[PDB]
Design a protein around this ligand. Structure first.
Ligand SMILES: [Ca+2]
Lengths: 98, 99, 99, 99, 98, 98, 99
């Protein structure tokens, strides 16, 4: 069991997505980069430094947060047949809560 | 309303107000490109974007309930309860409409 | 009791004081590209764009009633009550025309 | 009456003067791309652009009467009384020509 | 024993990934540099100057850190049959710690 | 006669380069303007206003300076036929001195 | 040598330390896209760029004699007495190689 620690304002997200199944039985993956997804925040970076080496701008997401994000610019990472993505917090569109 | 979408930064959630326009023959042809502006209702607003330094969030100029005119370009479609929603940057909001 | 359009940021609502480009055979050739500058009347103005400190809005240099020369590029057409309007950035306004 | 034009921001109104481009065959050829720079006279100047903070308009470096060298690109042609004028950003002005 | 010193916010990384063979014995390299990799930070730049130009903003990686990064924009450098990459600290996605 | 006064951070440069024939007596000029040239600074603008709005950032070239520069983005100006160029101080690569 | 080149801003003059690579037949083939990074010696350095304030020049992180790795892209070739030189921004310098 490894432990990934995102840098700057990048976060690690666990893809809660599932490929769509065609009626004929074919399964087409979601190569869709523009297609936004819903996942869970697993790790967050410290935050980006401001103009001067003063303070880190806290992120607006935390571990456990369910979020909607864009895959574009993201980096896929698999671990124990698990899908993960490393993306900038600016790609996160919104947080979904119950 | 079990689920609740909370936009980040200066993005907002808008509920599209419109209807599939029909052709004289009885056909409906939507707008996939999303290049025409639209009218909708602000459902949720983000906190806003952090200023240069990072000590203040510049408040947005729209609020829940506001009817606005916006550009779908760059926006993201989200359906829920057969309802159409769009997540866009407040910069895409052109004006607020008020009777 | 009537719909009123309110421009966000430094955008302004302008009304049409010109007609479509005419021809020698009578055919009306509209401009879809919107590359020719036009002349219109400022109908509504936005509050202005926030400075940086998030402190003050930089007032615009146009007011309702002003006749202005502007670029249609980047503008958004809006028709209401049968009149043609345009929502554009205050940066697209070239000059104010006064008697 | 004779309406006057009032440039906004750092834009200025310039009056153009062009030589006879008559080719040998008595054919004159205009510059559509407006790539070639020209010489003209500053007729009106804008107040100047606001600063980031919002405490001053940075004065322009040209004044009425100044003969200047400028790029037509980005400029907007305006013909009043047969004469040709141009509205351009002060950034397009290259140099001021003085006797 | 020449030693490389990265400038600004660039870091020198040692690629520790391994060419993969095809079922035919062939070997296929990744020239486009679009796939992220895992490596070890060998040297780090002082960091970028702040707005005011008085202090540099320290980087969030240190020598010995195992990182996940994007090869895009990076520059390959070989020395003693060892593969190295000079990249911007912005290309480093996360630090991997056992 | 007349004296050109550059605005902002633009400068007037007098081209010193001259044409070069071929083995056939032919001459090929540089329409592209991608080759850098050597010339003399004739007049310099006041300099660009700081973002603040209270100070002109002095340029690093003075009249009489021989400089190497890029013609790209430059504007040609012929007077008494002397070939001149109006370019941004940012196109000035270096100053050549004895 | 007599004439000496003095780089401006944060640009530096580097002396190309790269060589030819003859093919088995004889004929040697050189670079041409300028994407391949090179190694060379810093011969001269500019004073550095003035911050936004304009009160101070941010010193460069390279000095004369430094052996550096750099990108030729954006560089400008300069020959003299047979030796090849390049004028590039200090931003193209990747690292300093020391022994
Ligand atoms: Ca701060």
């Amino acid at each position: 069991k490894v432990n990934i620690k995102p840098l700057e304002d990048k976060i690690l997200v666990q893809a809660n997505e599932a490929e769509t199944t065609t009626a004929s039985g074919l399964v087409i993956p979601d190569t869709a980069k523009e297609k936004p997804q819903e996942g869970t925040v697993v790790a967050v970076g410290p935050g980006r430094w401001d103009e001067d080496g003063e303070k880190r701008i806290p992120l607006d997401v935390a571990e456990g947060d369910t979020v909607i994000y864009s895959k574009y610019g993201g980096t896929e990472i698999k671990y124990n047949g698990e899908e993960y993505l490393i993306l900038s917090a600016r790609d996160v569109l919104a947080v979904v809560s119950k």
